[PDB]
Design a protein around this ligand. Structure first.
Ligand SMILES: [Mg+2]
Ligand SMILES: [Mg+2]
Ligand SMILES: [Mg+2]
Ligand SMILES: [Mg+2]
Lengths: 123, 123, 130, 134
């Protein structure tokens, strides 16, 4: 029953700031606590970000984006296993196993996340 | 105001069947109608699937998976622009701009989808 | 979970266009002409137990990445069957460069020359040897 | 395509992709990545091409087997980038997660020895790629 979980960073774990002072992006401390609890329990935590794909481009993420992001995540005390970049950008993903951070936090608060059932058509 | 949308195929547009007779996968006709309406209105429709990644493997999706999928989508009368494969598999994606098909259908039924706002931390 | 592999099996990746077949600007893809020598050489390696992957950029500029699955793959796969090519894997969305400089790369002319002499399987890749 | 025209400038900019390991630097099994030794002739050649206006992309498989794809960003990139800075390499793009094959057979591929040879002779920029010529 160990889950394989994928989290956005921006406007999810931290809040976007248009000043783009990335190392100082502000955490949602409730998200950090919840992810850390899941990490401690033995779930796999992957972070996946589109950051930089439009601003510096795919060839520059490694140099120009990753240092400040990784440092931010350390400063806010986030535990995670995997960090993946080059996420594509859509206005919406419609996905049977997707959840927004508000629902995630609500379920974690109630202790209901680990057994929460994903969508099925049930035709 | 034109949206860039990404949809799962399995257990989203169609229902999974363990017999893996892919061409005969059953459509959620409400999903098909909703997607077609968005297509007709000018939104970009991308389908993104993990199908085959575990069963035939990434080198075989092009040969062994795509033909029956494309035929199924034609038989059900789905309109779409883009079809992408090799989707990674997670138990959950936690994403500020994600939605499950039930919420998608509910919003489309009400005429609220196009202006529905994505999640922000609002710290 | 033991997978069977010939001892000294090679994992090989081949371009399709201007490699296995010749480009034609008419873009009648199903009728692209094969280099029969390439087809024979690849088939020989397939028969010996090597893994054959085909990797193509076809369509990336003409129809775009979202359309390759629908508009490019059928005629390509049919072409490869018609020319009698044996292979294991087919991958798309290859990036486009004027040159890849790579320690384990070879152009089709060298590939054919080595295969003619029976020297391909043991041919050594580049090392700096500084 | 008249020489010196915009079209000519554009056509003469090449889009180049280089391996890092056993190409720009030499592999060492000790995996002390920051101290990997440069082929100074490769560094000079790439820097010359960078200065002349060509696009320089580096592409590496490093880490894919040792730490895995989820860890390359954290565990592999810092020491690689530092190495490339210490050796004085100029480049535009750095890409990871390269797949591994024993050989790529490709109409537009060249090994570092041929690359260096052509650069030494001033013949790289106009060197023609392979065509079947059936
Ligand atoms: Mg799904
Ligand atoms: Mg997001
Ligand atoms: Mg290499
Ligand atoms: Mg090619």
């Amino acid at each position: 029953n160990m889950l394989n979980l994928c989290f956005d960073v921006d406007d999810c774990i931290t809040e976007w700031n248009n000043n783009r002072d990335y190392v100082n992006f502000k955490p949602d401390v409730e998200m950090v606590s919840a992810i850390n609890a899941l990490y401690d329990a033995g779930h796999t935590i992957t972070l996946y970000t589109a950051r930089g794909m439009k601003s510096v481009g795919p060839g520059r993420i490694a140099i120009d984006i990753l240092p400040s992001l990784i440092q931010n995540l350390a400063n806010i005390g986030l535990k995670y296993h995997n960090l993946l970049t080059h996420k594509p950008v859509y206005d919406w993903i419609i996905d049977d196993k997707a959840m927004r951070p508000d629902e995630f936090k609500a379920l974690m608060n109630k202790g209901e996340f680990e057994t929460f059932k994903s969508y099925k058509p049930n035709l």
